[PDB]
């Protein structure tokens, strides 16, 4: 069955934006379609890279299934629950995208993350992650003790290195900071590699797709 999004965009739903809660009883799908203008695109302001290419791909698939690749409790080195924002509310309190994890410092430290996930499935995996661009130097230190940070994402077909741009931006949904999100398709035997000392928005859930 085709997934028709009533109030939400593709980006918002894949990331699991709290503002798009629509009743879904059956968790298997064929493809994803976006009609007209979505009420909620991104609750935390920012950008979604290669969005047009991704929407075409997800309308080009005949099977769509969500799965948990990296459990949020598997981060014992950092804080995976406290990173939240008022721009993404849930039940009146601060929250975040459900399918992606905002990692912040545990105590006074943010150790360097080296984590690898190998696709062990028989299907292509849609994997999403992000980078957070903090408001100023003060906010950077608040969230992650390390002033100078990076995000490395490797795959056999991709080499990415991100450096957060610390700048004050226009207030959208109450926030002067931004978040940039990225995606790739992980081949059934290929593995994705992450390295970060800060500003990393880590994947929890991914999506098995069939062409």
């Amino acid at each position, epitope marked *: 069955k085709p997934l028709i999004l009533r109030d939400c965009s593709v980006a918002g739903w894949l990331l699991g934006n709290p503002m798009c809660d629509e009743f879904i009883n059956v968790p298997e799908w064929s493809y994803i379609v976006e009609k007209a203008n979505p009420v909620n695109d991104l609750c935390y302001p920012g950008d979604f890279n290669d969005y047009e290419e991704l929407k075409h791909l997800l309308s080009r698939i005949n099977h769509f299934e969500k799965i948990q690749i990296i459990p949020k409790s598997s981060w014992s080195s950092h804080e995976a629950s406290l990173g939240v924002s008022s*721009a993404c509310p849930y*039940q*009146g309190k601060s929250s975040f995208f459900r399918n992606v994890v905002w990692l912040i410092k545990k105590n006074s430290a943010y150790p360097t993350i080296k984590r690898s996930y190998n696709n062990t499935n028989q299907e292509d995996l849609l994997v999403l992650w992000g980078i957070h661009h903090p408001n100023d130097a003060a906010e950077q230190t*608040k969230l992650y003790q390390n002033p100078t940070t990076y995000i490395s994402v490797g795959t056999s077909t991709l080499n990415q290195r991100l450096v957060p741009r610390i700048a004050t931006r226009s207030k959208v949904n109450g926030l002067s900071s931004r978040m940039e999100f990225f995606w790739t398709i992980l081949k059934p035997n290929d593995a994705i590699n992450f390295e970060s000392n800060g500003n990393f928005i880590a994947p929890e859930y991914a999506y098995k797709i069939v062409k």
Partner: antibody
Framework: QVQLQESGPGLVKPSGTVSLTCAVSGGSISSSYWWSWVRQPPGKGLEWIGEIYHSGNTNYNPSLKSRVTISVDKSKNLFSLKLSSVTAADTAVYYC????????????????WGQGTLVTVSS | YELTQPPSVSVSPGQTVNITCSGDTLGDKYVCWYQQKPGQSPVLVIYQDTKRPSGIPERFSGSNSGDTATLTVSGTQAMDEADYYCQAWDSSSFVFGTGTKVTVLG
């Protein structure tokens, strides 16, 4: 400006229920704000009691959690406090306050505050 | 969870006074500060560690690192004599500091 006003009986007998309400003017109870109760026994520090959101969600001080109830009346545009099974340790000045969320992370700040009302527990 | 403040501090008029607030992993939490005159309601001076509400003089400033937060008043006047409480949030509970009395020596 938004203003908060506490009212209720200033004298409650031991084992009785402290019953207070907070009138909100200048703003609506249905907001992104939370509505909190805070008490201060005479000559002592501030103590958080609990809070409530217009949807009905509540959060209470775990040490008072057994005997405390906070509710909200959207029509009369007010929220209220019921603290049961009181003792002399419950004699305090009771404040109500509006709580705002941080743009990032957990918690929030209290503003504005009501004038506060003294509640004495004595038989 | 508890927030510890010094019971009292005194400061000469025109000098600078630091009000400290201590707690476990307090640097991971945003801290707020409240001014209270006797027989009156608390007044927000500093929220989200460094921010001043409109109507609060630039005299007031705050900072937070490690396990300790600090409220700072520079060139303090007579009207700045009051009680000061730090505040934070932990595990679905709001927490207030024990309070600090600031006396400007007259």
């Amino acid at each position: 400006q938004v203003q908060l006003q506490e009212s209720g009986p200033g004298l409650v007998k031991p084992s009785g229920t402290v019953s207070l309400t907070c009138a909100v003017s200048g703003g609506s109870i249905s907001s992104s704000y939370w509505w909190s109760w805070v008490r201060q026994p005479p000559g002592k520090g501030l103590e958080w009691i609990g809070e409530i959101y217009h949807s009905g969600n509540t959060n209470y001080n775990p040490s008072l959690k057994s005997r405390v109830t906070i509710s909200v009346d959207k029509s009369k545009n007010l929220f209220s406090l019921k603290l049961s099974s009181v003792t002399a340790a419950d004699t305090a000045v009771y404040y109500c306050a509006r709580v705002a969320l941080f743009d990032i992370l957990t918690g929030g700040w209290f503003d504005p505050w009501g004038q506060g009302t003294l509640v004495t527990v004595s038989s | 969870y508890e927030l510890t403040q010094p019971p009292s501090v005194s400061v000469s008029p025109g000098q600078t006074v630091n009000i400290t607030c201590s707690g476990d992993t307090l640097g991971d939490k945003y801290v707020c500060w409240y001014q209270q005159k006797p027989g009156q309601s608390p007044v927000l001076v500093i929220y989200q560690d460094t921010k001043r509400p409109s109507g609060i003089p630039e005299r007031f400033s705050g900072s937070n690192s490690g396990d300790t937060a600090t409220l700072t008043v520079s060139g303090t006047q007579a009207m700045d004599e009051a009680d000061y409480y730090c505040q934070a949030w932990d595990s679905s509970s709001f927490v207030f500091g024990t309070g600090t009395k600031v006396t400007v020596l007259g």
